[PDB]
Amino acid sequence: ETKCTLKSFTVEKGIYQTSNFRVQPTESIVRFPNITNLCPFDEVFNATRFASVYAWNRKRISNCVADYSVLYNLAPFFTFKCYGVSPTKLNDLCFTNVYADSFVIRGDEVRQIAPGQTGNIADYNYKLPDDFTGCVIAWNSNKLDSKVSGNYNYLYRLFRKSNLKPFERDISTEIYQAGNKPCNGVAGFNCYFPLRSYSFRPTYGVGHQPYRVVVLSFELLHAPATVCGPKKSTNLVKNKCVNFNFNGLKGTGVLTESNKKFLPFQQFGRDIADTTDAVRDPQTLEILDITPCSFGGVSVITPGTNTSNQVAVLYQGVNCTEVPVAIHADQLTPTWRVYSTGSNVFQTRAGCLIGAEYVNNSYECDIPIGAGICASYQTQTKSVASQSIIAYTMSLGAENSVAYSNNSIAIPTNFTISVTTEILPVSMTKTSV
Amino acid sequence: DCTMYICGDSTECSNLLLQYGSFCTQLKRALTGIAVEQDKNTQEVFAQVKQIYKTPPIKYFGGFNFSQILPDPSKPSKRSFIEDLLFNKVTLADAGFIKQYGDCLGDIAARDLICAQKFKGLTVLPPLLTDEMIAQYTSALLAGTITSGWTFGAGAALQIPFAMQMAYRFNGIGVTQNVLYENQKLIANQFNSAIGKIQDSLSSTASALGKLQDVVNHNAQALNTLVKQLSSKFGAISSVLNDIFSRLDKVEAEVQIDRLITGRLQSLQTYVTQQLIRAAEIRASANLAATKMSECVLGQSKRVDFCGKGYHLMSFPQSAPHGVVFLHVTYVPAQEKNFTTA
Amino acid sequence: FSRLDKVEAEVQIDRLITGRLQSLQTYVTQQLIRAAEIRASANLAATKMSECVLGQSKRVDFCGKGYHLMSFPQSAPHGVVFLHVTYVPAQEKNFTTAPAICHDGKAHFPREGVFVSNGTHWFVTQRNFYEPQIITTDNTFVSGNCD
Amino acid sequence: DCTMYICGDSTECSNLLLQYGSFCTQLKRALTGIAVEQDKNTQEVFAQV
């Protein structure tokens, strides 16, 4: 791993950083609230009639299991367009407050139901905001609701004094004026009843025949959930690394029981970095801490490669008892499990040091480990002999008490003339690009 | 860890990061370059003696009272009285002490900011020279100075009586050595009183070690900013990396994620540049501090105002968190009379 | 450019332009920071040329470990090597010493150097090399009474 | 003024700038850091009496 980090077949004497170790999760976990009934979707998708789009009807969907697949398998209603999610995720995710908005329009006006659009249908009777999270569904209804004498009980507001707000509804029936004079009462010149009808007769041209529309406008991922996709809760587990999901909040971490007192209206807690670090469990109402699985830097300590291939490893910031628990019965980022055997393990103040043997006698610092410890390759033979990596507390210099006394002096009877080199950089290579 | 900072616990973000590759390795190499410089700075300043001098058990020095700048053997840490004040003025954040995880999680996870930085892959590494080994080098420089004067700088330490060392100093400032011996009890009482005022100042006022606290506050501020930058949306749909992969297809999730990758990678590049510029400023201070160790502790300097306001006599080094404190001793002329001259 | 239209080739190329331009900006910043570090070394090397080659420096350990005598500059690739020459004192002896000699009510101090005894006699010697001399009114000066 | 430099007299650009936020505050703090250094340099050089 040091050879690949440095991109070399020969590694010089030193301590080198390498890829951080990370414990991988041992299982996946899923939690959703135990809502067992399939949602009342079909209670709108095959029903008597839908409201006139000037007075579009809004249904709240809650305390139930969504399954988009079983409805789309039944329903002749062959269309999709999404804005805040992919359709492929709708089966995976879960939702807070869910409203289906139900109405009828012409097949060519379907494009106006997208967010940010304009034209009188979008301006005067149904508006989606620029940050709409949801999808638009539509289907032709001429097979069921178009009539050759006409079905004029579908109405839309052609006139309004100003463009309406997102998710406002307007059922006012007072007259409207394009002439500048007060056209009071029931009519006037250039003045109008504000609602019109659709010429839905089966022999019409394409895109004028009736389309039934439903817009789903769900909130998701940051508030207590009431409608979930159809996947199944697992058991809960604690003190172990897992791929959790709570209410659609995917993440890898270790769960733990918490004393963070979430108030009744809360569902998630977050850190200064805007990430979820606690979450109340949707099945049993307790708060769980979320911590990232155990990880840290890995430093490799080597003599020069042309001196030897044996190396020691420092797991920086890690308590030594953690490394025997980091045993490769599961996956870890470093695949080279063999260092886990230990027997010569030392807890330095800088981290758990493995493969170097700690010795009681000091030396000059050869490779710096940290916090007063250094490591070196030498023949450990104080008492057949072999080279190994030792670790030691560094010497500062020779011990020397001074023979001071209140009337003693030392004076040199001779001298040495010594010549010493000192080397200083003056320049670096000029470069142009 | 650029991978855990940019792509916090995400597999698929880590595979998009590799399209940049070498960009993270430049950051790792640059921060490792700064980290080795800190140990080198500390060696240049403190390891100016190849022998560890001890002071003798008879603590008498012509009436000068070093008992508050020398080690006190009774303390578990072998620092002096004045060093044990200095270590309380500078409130540190994380000396790289290992976290046994149970100290990171639970109650402490609610309020401690060091564990929160670590969970974003930002780690403070320990110095090679611990505060006890810096206290030992500082004791060696001081024991050398009070028992042997400048001589331990130029060769082997040669003993001299401390009042005869002070006479050599007085000749150094152009005052004839009889002016020491005729006034030795006064010169000692003045020095002992002046050392007493160092403890009083450092025990009384907070606004003294600001030059060292500012270095801790700059690193703490720069990491708190770098943690807070993870909140930035960079024009993506969200900050939360999971909430993008949980809501989009691999074709346009890659547009929402590449923004967060670009913005977070630029945030690390800014931190490393800001750290290199400070490390250059700290180095310049370490080169000055090593020069003052050589010219004010290992010698007497005739340079005006280099070793404090006055004429330089002697200086005594004391360790402090991330720094050095020099107690400079200076002769200052006090009561002038007018004379006629020719 | 061999695989796209001018309308979306401009999206694929602008990425490479943005990333490569950021790579040069990083190199120039990294070069300016080193050039500042090299300059600081050149300012030191010019100061050592002035104070250790063109002169003798009384600054402790500035011109090498010892007492500075002379230094000789040598060129090297991108740098300078100084051969510093230093007097280092080598073979010390313990002596008894005193701050003053009392002779005739008057107290005597060394003019230059220090008083020493081999154990029976007394001498003046210069501080940094043992060369003993008989104590005289030419080796010493007087100030005050002995008490 | 990063707002004035980036989003010169524009309201809606200023609201897009806030999606970065802290990035401008680092610039303001860094330039304020240089500005206090100039006064300190001038005190160190001239105010020696």
Place this chain on the structure above:
Amino acid sequence: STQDLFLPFFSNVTWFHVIKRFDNPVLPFNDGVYFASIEKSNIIRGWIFGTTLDSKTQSLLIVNNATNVVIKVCEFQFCNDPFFDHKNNKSWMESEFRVYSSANNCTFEYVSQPFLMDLEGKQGNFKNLREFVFKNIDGYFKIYSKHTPIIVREPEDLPQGFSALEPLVDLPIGINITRFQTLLALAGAAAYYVGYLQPRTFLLKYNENGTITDAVDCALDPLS
């Protein structure tokens, strides 16, 4: 740090006070409202919200009657002096319901129990403070509230201290609200206060229990 519609600090709330004196006036409701009453024995019972109040367009109603609640939005024709009669329950109880004459096209209704309980155990003259915030934002009407039983101030009002409103309810009502009004019982001694929300950056302090415990209105003064 958050930007929302909040009540600016040290702002002039309008103050209303019943006795034979009554004050049921219609007030504007622009961007949203802080409403509070310092109250005993339930005299205030709810609010009307709308734009016309005379069935030509819908309007909202909230009421706490004797044993429960109603929340409804409809083409109401509200009575121009809406009130209830009880006189401390001296000899008769709930009987007349002067709130609307008609309720034509209705598009949401809800019913519950007796909203907002009193303090427990009582104490001498010990009144309680009811606080609310009402917002209307892209079809949703959002209600936040707090209750704090606190010792009565006498010439003073709206007492010094800090406490945060929890979120109560969200109603998907889909209507323009521009004006609002308050419902009272017929004597009592209730007082109420109305303030207007404005867009304003607030910096909030959360303690280790995660309750908001202090705040700075960043536009109040240069120190803020």
